[PDB]
Design a protein around this ligand. Structure first.
Ligand SMILES: Nc1ncnc2c1ncn2[C@@H]1O[C@H](COP(=O)(O)OP(=O)(O)OP(=O)(O)O)[C@@H](O)[C@H]1O
Ligand SMILES: Nc1ncnc2c1ncn2[C@@H]1O[C@H](COP(=O)(O)OP(=O)(O)O)[C@@H](O)[C@H]1O
Ligand SMILES: [Mg+2]
Ligand SMILES: [Mg+2]
Lengths: 503, 456, 35, 187, 470, 105, 128
């Protein structure tokens, strides 16, 4: 009875070593080491095993320490020596990490040499309080029409990408990362967004394909990739989101703006549940520990918009959550929906009905809302949202709509046109002014006479048109952020003449 | 009494003392830390060891670190100096405006008022809001479930209740942000500053804020409601006021209690809730009541998990609720503000023996004509167009301009007394204004303002 | 929840399948004689 | 470090502490001294005054540790048993003390080569027959073995004798024979 | 080496105490005094110089105090060309009664996964000859595939069809691992391969290695047999550079085996009774089944779905480890359509118009869209009947039923079940057939002509013969 | 004297583990040093589990538990008519004590 | 015994749900930790090591066989329960019986839609 009541320890005490900064493994199993001694170790402190493996002291018990191992169990045997490092876990931060693929501890896994950063940051710092923050006021552009119009995200928000498997969540995140190239290339320094992609529990092949896709789009020069893949220890998959969050808080603290994608938090919660069940912590619903909500909430509250006295920087978070058969009432989906400021919800029926991205606009919500939009996108998206809400109200009457009054048929027609307008191709994010032009064509009525199957084609051709021969109006809308009356008349003329000459 | 940490497991800390074991619910101060770390005793484990739940993070804690017994439960500053300030669960200021210089501190753990201190007959709490006072009135010392979240003007209604109870009754308010989003807490702080409810320059602040953030351990989120209740208890028992106490959210209070109980190793009950769910809710809610000195009326935001009203958390909360205010988006997208759903909002004191026969009959007539109008709208006779007209006028006259919006809209705010509301709806039902147009009732106070708007 | 009536296999999914099979066997007999 | 396992095995808190003490004493080959010292401390703690004072949970652990240090130094105890009692008082396993002793004792009982022997009979056996029985049962053992015989009496076997030597077992009771005859006649 | 003693035996879990030299975790231990070989794999160090181990065979007849010998390494199996045509078990012993497997090298069945720099981003379609797979969710050369399905939907038949087609169209040392499945099926596969020249009993030029741990095995054997087969395939990939096929049936059993020892290893249960370590075990096993820059491993895994859930933690955790998931639906198998692939639930990572082409992508997306529209129209059919739809709705329903029938294909390995003969349809034939059915080029042909045929020419011929007879 | 009195070993979860009370009966009312009462639920070889009729905040480890020698009973009679009492029979209406001559288990 | 001597035998296990219940009782009383529905972790092994012993032998081993007809009782038709799904995944096919089919006059109440024989026509006479 008792972990430290082994016959070896008791026999050594009966016979009559440093047990302050050093300890001995009483037992090792499933990634958990019960360590004797270490009487000076701190909670959540890093320790070193004799084989070189690192661990974190999570359970400080009266007679033993519960250490989670950052590696394989076979390199640790009973009686191995454990040393203190004297420090809580911390990662390297700085702009030296832009363009690198690191692991959950900031170690390069791309072979391009050691991260030459100078600054380190604790992974478990507390979020900013009430006063250091300001209201989320400036748009974080994703380049996706449905998101940018109906589910707008601001710099400092926390928007959840939630949905079943194989619905397009990583695609939304990667389109958002690719979109920021137009801002990071330009000279306006307050529109630049540095991206961090944290991959938790994925294949290494998946992360390799993602890094290749980001390199082909030239999006890697401003992106950090933190990958704790599926063959990594549960401690590393647990720690990777906080490493990424510290890397992004370095930017948030220095007047710069960062976006972070946790892909996904379901797998981090699973890794934490494993670590907790093996430490014999009391399980709760779905065997999850009692402080898994605390886990995700203290992770997600660190994404904040700072006021002007603290640099004015920001950190936007896009956590990803995989539901099982659309069950948003499961434990971890419930927690993360409760923590965030809205959710982009993706469906499978919408996916196979031809609607890509499969964004369910009825279930999606942004609590920041129009404060995270531009005046032009406000102008067009208010009307588009009202019209799509009416279309959703009357959509059940479709497949019979030909036998209903003119108002219902017009609602159905405008809704089908706008729904065909929100479709988009993968890895091709649009500028906000081109989105504004397309939505303007859609909501002002210049598509009602057109056939649905043609809408996409129009939206493509028109776009090319307005990109070549109407760059002046695009530049005006982009520089003024709103559609002036002159710009409104110019848009009207452009669209009516194009539609007059359209096939 | 000085003890030393013998175990640290997450947010649970076992502390061993050598003399003078502290009672349960006492606050202990961990020594040698940059920020204040407070533990709260939960059990006596034997061998002079107590188990405690932490109010902040436990990273960097060392076995053997000294811990001081404070001698009482968590004590928070109580007084008029807390008005307009923000404090956390342990009573320290989190708005960076300096210390809260009250004269007295109160423990956040207190027993409910005794049996002979209760009020033996229920009275109404007049809020000056027409739809609330008429159809689903609030009781003094009662609990009100506020349904509906974002986009229905929940914060505007909260601030207007604060302003109206400060004006009509002279009673201050406390707002407990249990499980508060820090972004939305900053938002609420600044909307309260702009609408004058909080004043950073003089002592005319009407509300005191207590924020237990969403990124705090479950103990802080389980005790922040008690902190706010302690501030309100001071305002009631020492100044004889009719205090308002907002709890946003109450489901998060239940959730934090469940997480704390799971951390202490207790066997979960049905649906995973703490076995002590009903008694935790009861020990909190029974302190919200009318005593002989004053009263505390609590508006509590209700979240329903999975839309299941038989879920243990709502089912336990609903046993204490005296009224219900449902904010509907089908009413806001219709143009009516406040967006209270007049057919789904309920009240237990909507009883002729409590509010009188006249109030009850006016409210019942209004509700019956609104249900009739819904029925008639379903099928879109002789006098049914007259019912449609009267019901549309009733819907318009349920609206009201708020004072806390005067800066953004320009319209003056109206605090309609109870008699004027009752008689205005009585007259509209009788037919005294069947000639006045439909939009002469939209966004007015008493019915005299409706006739003055019809003149134009 | 598209196709959930047939997916539940109730008294309404069986009659849906019966209707489809009746109609399309009639149509197959009509299309085979004209071939 | 490698630990020396006793010839017999005992488990639990008492068995673990006894294995520890046996290893720590066989290393210094001081087994009999600690045996007699454990008997001494057992007789000491068994006395009701100490058995009441140091077995009290509502008095501090350090006070009873100091009193145990007093009672082990005052009676001229070896450092082995001294810090053994100190360890027992530190972990809080003082209540298991006797148990430890018991465990240790039986370990030494098989270290001296003492095998238990039960000889159940229907009546008190004859003394010369008992001597012949002991003599012949000596032959069931290896070298360095000694019968610790306890010829308890059960008159329900109706005759013969049931012998158990350690775990070896011969059932020569006549009741067993009659039950075998019954099972043979019925089957 | 180190010698210990068995101190506890509970089921398939054996606690062994060592005096000198505690063996590391994952080592193999030999139980001395047994007529057959009993290997114990170390799982945990319990303290007190004791380790807990899982037995690779049955524990009947084990005695407390029985001696155990440390191998000094994990389970080591023979690897090399000499494993081809042989059947070995979890510990590398031959179970085909053909003598010792004499290889020059042994490999431990526990190894690290390839690093991040070793990954390969190349994706190239592997044409299988199956219409639904080739069209709606094509496989990739050197990718992980995965076949999801409940009990009796066609996972084994489909994996045998894939064996036939690909592994005969292949020259690169395929490997098959039978994990916790039926022994009758293993005998059937062995004799099919001997008959079809893929395994050569004399004149040893076989091209498939077999590893089998079946249902009668204890949980340890069923948990490590997948790693044994993985190790053979890993040798073929790394130590020769060859392009390898790996067929694992059924991989769910791997996970299941772990659960069956979890409580006995002292672990608090997780959700649905699974081990707490389900995801990390599946990850350490699955991340080794991958194509590196050293060589290619095309992996086809059958994945059992308990009670047709697909939200069960084991299939749900397997989903993220694959590149082209094929989901077999019982509702489609009840329609008589075989293979029972779900067209609206199967996904490929190379279903990208920048990889397969715009015509293939457009045809696949149009097929999926018309099938989703058919699903939506079935409700209106249920309430109103088929005689009340707009003529375009009836056209949609007719074309969708034709596409459903034409997605079915007769298999060579199913001639005993079907009766029909097998077909192996090229990629462009599939694309053309479905493009024409989508365009409306066969609105005059009956829907029953597309059922259980090959390309569209066979559909026209069957329609002609039907018209002649009927 | 650990036959009529005991010491609280542990308190929590509404249960007090008490050391002593060797002559206590099962389901007997015990009186804590703070004025609360309890019922002996589990007689065990080395402790007594006591169900506390009140708050565990008022009971500390090391407190003295005396035994009242009576199985849990309440005052009964005509003298309770018109009174408001708690679950233990103590008047909570401020009208003074209950003048009952009879108790009942 | 018959299988190994060139003879053919048939065994019916009526039923295996009650064997699972008895094994659960033994395991819970042996203080082995419970799993799903309190059943031990290795109930699948319990039934698979039993149902694998039904086999057809080749000529070198006598040519004998052992056929097995395990019986499983489901609650309210819940085929998806623990032990039913275990035994369904083990065996070579199932014969599903239904209460609705039973009371509608279909006796034996075999559900031909669900009832499958993984061996099929391979084990029939040519006329049949
Ligand atoms: N807007 C789009 N248009 C066309 N195809 C798309 C679009 N978005 C995603 N896809 C495709 O749908 C498939 C699934 O998308 P994706 O993998 O990015 O989502 P996911 O939910 O993260 O998947 P997983 O379950 O594996 O994590 C991908 O093949 C992707 O190429
Ligand atoms: N491609 C197919 N064609 C015809 N029948 C099939 C086909 N696949 C499966 N079946 C039928 O379904 C049964 C189940 O076969 P199997 O491959 O063992 O399914 P699983 O392995 O998923 O349990 C087969 O015996 C067969 O009767
Ligand atoms: Mg993804
Ligand atoms: Mg199979």
């Amino acid at each position: 009875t008792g972990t430290a009541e082994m016959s070896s320890i008791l026999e050594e005490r009966i016979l009559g070593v440093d047990l302050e900064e050093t300890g001995r493994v009483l037992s090792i199993g499933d990634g958990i080491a019960r360590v004797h001694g270490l009487r000076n170790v701190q909670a959540e402190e890093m320790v070193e095993f004799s084989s070189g493996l690192k661990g974190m002291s999570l359970n400080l018990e009266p007679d033993n320490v519960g250490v989670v191992v950052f590696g394989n169990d076979k390199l640790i045997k009973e009686g191995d020596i454990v040393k203190r490092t004297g420090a809580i876990v911390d990662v390297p931060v700085g702009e030296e990490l832009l363009g690198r693929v690191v692991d959950a501890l900031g170690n390069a896994i791309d072979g391009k040499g050691p991260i030459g950063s100078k600054t380190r940051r604790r992974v478990g710092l507390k979020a900013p309080g009430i006063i250091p923050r300001i209201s989320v006021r400036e748009p974080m552009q994703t380049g996706i029409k449905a998101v940018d119009s109906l589910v707008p995200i601001g710099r400092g928000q926390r928007e959840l990408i939630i949905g079943d498997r194989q619905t397009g969540k990583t695609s939304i995140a990667i389109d958002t990362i690719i979109n920021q190239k137009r801002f990071n290339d330009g000279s306006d320094e307050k529109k630049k967004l540095y991206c961090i992609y944290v991959a938790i529990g994925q294949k290494r092949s998946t992360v390799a394909q993602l890094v290749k896709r980001l390199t082909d789009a030239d999006a890697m020069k401003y992106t950090i990739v933190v990958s704790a893949t599926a063959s990594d220890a549960a401690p590393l998959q647990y720690l990777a989101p906080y490493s990424g969050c510290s890397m992004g808080e370095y930017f948030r603290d220095n007047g710069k703006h960062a976006l972070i994608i946790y892909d996904d938090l379901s797998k981090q919660a699973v890794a934490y549940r494993q670590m907790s069940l093996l430490l014999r912590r009391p399980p709760g619903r779905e065997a999850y520990p009692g402080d898994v909500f605390y886990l995700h909430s203290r992770l997600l509250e660190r994404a904040a918009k700072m006021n002007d006295a603290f640099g004015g920087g920001s950190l936007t978070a896009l956590p990803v959550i995989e539901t099982q058969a659309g069950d948003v009432s499961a434990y971890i989906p419930t927690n993360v929906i409760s923590i965030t400021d809205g959710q982009i919800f993706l469906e499978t029926e919408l996916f196979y009905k031809g609607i890509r991205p499969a964004i369910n606009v009825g279930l999606s919500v942004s609590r920041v809302g129009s404060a995270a939009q531009t005046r032009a996108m406000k102008q067009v998206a208010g009307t588009m949202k009202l019209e799509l809400a009416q279309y959703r109200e009357v959509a059940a009457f479709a497949q019979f709509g030909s036998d209903l009054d003119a108002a219902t048929q017009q609602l159905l027609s405008r809704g089908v046109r706008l729904t065909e307008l929100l479709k988009q191709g993968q890895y091709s994010p649009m500028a906000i002014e081109e989105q504004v032009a397309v939505i303007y064509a859609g909501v002002r009525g210049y598509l009602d006479k057109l056939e649905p199957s043609k809408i996409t084609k129009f939206e493509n051709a028109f776009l090319s048109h307005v990109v070549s021969q109407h760059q002046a109006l695009l530049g005006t809308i982009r520089a003024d952020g709103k559609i002036s009356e002159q710009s409104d008349a110019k848009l009207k003329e452009i669209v009516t003449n194009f539609l007059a000459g359209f096939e | 009494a000085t003890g030393r940490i013998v175990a640290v497991i997450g947010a649970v800390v076992d502390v061993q003392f050598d003399e003078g074991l502290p009672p349960i619910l006492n606050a202990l101060e961990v020594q040698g830390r940059e920020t204040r770390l407070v533990l709260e005793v939960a059990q006596h484990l034997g061998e002079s060891t107590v188990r405690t739940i932490a109010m902040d993070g436990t990273e960097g804690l060392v076995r053997g670190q000294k811990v001081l017994d404070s001698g009482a439960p968590i004590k928070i500053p109580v007084g008029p100096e807390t008005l307009g300030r923000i404090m956390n669960v342990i009573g320290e200021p989190i708005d960076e405006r300096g210390p809260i210089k009250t004269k007295q501190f109160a423990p956040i753990h207190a027993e409910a008022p005794e049996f002979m201190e209760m009020s033996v007959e229920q009275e109404i709490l007049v809020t000056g809001i027409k739809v609330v006072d008429l159809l689903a009135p609030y009781a003094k010392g009662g609990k009100i479930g506020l349904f509906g979240g974002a986009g229905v003007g929940k914060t505007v209604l909260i601030m207007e209740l604060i302003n109206n109870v400060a004006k009509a009754h002279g009673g201050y308010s406390v707002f407990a942000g249990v499980g508060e989003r820090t972004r939305e807490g900053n938002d609420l702080y600044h909307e309260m500053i702009e609408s004058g409810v909080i004043n950073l320059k003089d002592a005319t602040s009407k509300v005191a804020l207590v924020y237990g953030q969403m990124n705090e351990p479950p103990g802080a989120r389980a005790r922040v409601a008690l902190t706010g209740l302690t501030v309100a208890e001071y305002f009631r028992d020492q100044e004889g006021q009719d205090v308002l106490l907002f709890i946003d959210n109450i489901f998060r209070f239940t959730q934090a209690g469940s997480e704390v109980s799971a951390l202490l190793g207790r066997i979960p009950s049905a649906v995973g809730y703490q076995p002590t769910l009903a008694t935790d809710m009861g020990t909190m809610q029974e302190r919200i009541t009318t005593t002989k000195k004053g009263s505390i009326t609590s508006v509590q935001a209700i979240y329903v998990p999975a839309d299941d009203l038989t879920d243990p958390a709502p089912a336990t909360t609903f046993a204490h609720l005296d009224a219900t205010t449902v904010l509907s988006r089908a009413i806001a997208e219709l143009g009516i503000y406040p967006a209270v759903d007049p057919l789904d909002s309920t009240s237990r004191i909507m009883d002729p023996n409590i509010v009188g026969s006249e109030h009850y009959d006016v409210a019942r007539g209004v509700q019956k004509i609104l249900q009739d109008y819904k029925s008639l709208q379903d099928i879109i006779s002789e006098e049914d167009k007259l019912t449609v007209s009267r019901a549309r006028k009733i819907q318009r006259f349920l609206s009201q301009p708020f004072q806390v919006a005067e800066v953004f809209t320009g319209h003056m705010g109206k605090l309609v007394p109870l008699k004027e509301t009752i008689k205005g709806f009585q007259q509209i039902l009788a037919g005294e204004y069947d000639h006045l147009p439909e939009q002469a009732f939209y966004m007015v106070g008493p019915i005299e303002e409706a006739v003055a708007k019809a003149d134009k | 929840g598209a196709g959930s009536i047939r997916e539940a296999g109730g008294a309404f999914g069986k009659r849906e399948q019966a209707e489809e099979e009746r109609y399309f066997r009639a149509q197959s007999r009509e299309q085979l004689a004209a071939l | 470090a490698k630990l020396v396992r006793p010839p017999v095995q005992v488990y639990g808190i008492e068995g673990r502490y006894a294995t520890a003490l046996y290893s720590a004493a066989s290393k210094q080959n001081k087994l009999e001294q600690v045996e007699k010292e454990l008997l001494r401390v057992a007789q000491i703690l068994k006395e009701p005054k100490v058995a009441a004072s140091v077995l009290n949970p509502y008095v501090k652990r350090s006070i009873k540790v100091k009193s145990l240090n007093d009672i082990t130094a005052k009676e001229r105890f070896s450092p082995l048993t001294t810090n053994l009692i100190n360890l027992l008082a530190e972990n809080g396993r003082l209540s298991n003390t006797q148990g430890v002793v018991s465990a240790f004792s039986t370990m030494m009982s098989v270290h001296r080569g003492e095998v238990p022997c039960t000889v159940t009979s229907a009546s008190p056996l004859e003394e010369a027959t008992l001597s012949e029985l002991k003599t012949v049962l000596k032959s069931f053992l290896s070298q360095g073995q000694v019968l610790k015989l306890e010829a308890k009496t059960d008159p329900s076997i109706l005759g013969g004798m049931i012998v158990r030597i350690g775990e070896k077992y011969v059932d020569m009771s006549v009741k067993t024979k009659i039950q075998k005859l019954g099972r043979a006649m019925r089957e």
